Amino acid sequence: MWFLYGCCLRFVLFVLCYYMSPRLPSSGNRRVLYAVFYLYIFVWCVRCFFCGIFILSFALFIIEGGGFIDLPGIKYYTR
């Protein structure tokens, strides 16, 4: 929750959609969205997850953090 920076939901900006492989015993090809957002004049990069779905191209993303998933290092998920 470091990058949620305390608010309940944080808005960010799509950049890349790369695929990372979950942690064993699990198996998958999990969708890790390398996003960014400017906040408090420094700009930041947020490697996040995607459990939602996408219909229109929208680099508007509502990252709310979640539990742990079979991926090591992704504390943020989509709304």
Binding site: C51, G52, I53, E64, G66, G67, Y77, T78, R79
Partner: protein
């Protein structure tokens, strides 16, 4: 996590009409041997 990602609330039989529909419905043909003298309660 979020319950409504990839799909919203499944609206499935939001009125669930099977608990409603009564093609067999007692009518003026209630039995005077099994219904009350009012023919309203069995």
């Amino acid at each position: 996590r979020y319950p409504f990602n990839k799909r919203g609330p499944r609206e499935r039989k939001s009125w669930k009409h099977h608990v409603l529909t009564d093609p067999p419905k007692p009518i003026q043909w209630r039995d005077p041997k099994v219904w009350t003298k009012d023919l309203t309660t069995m």
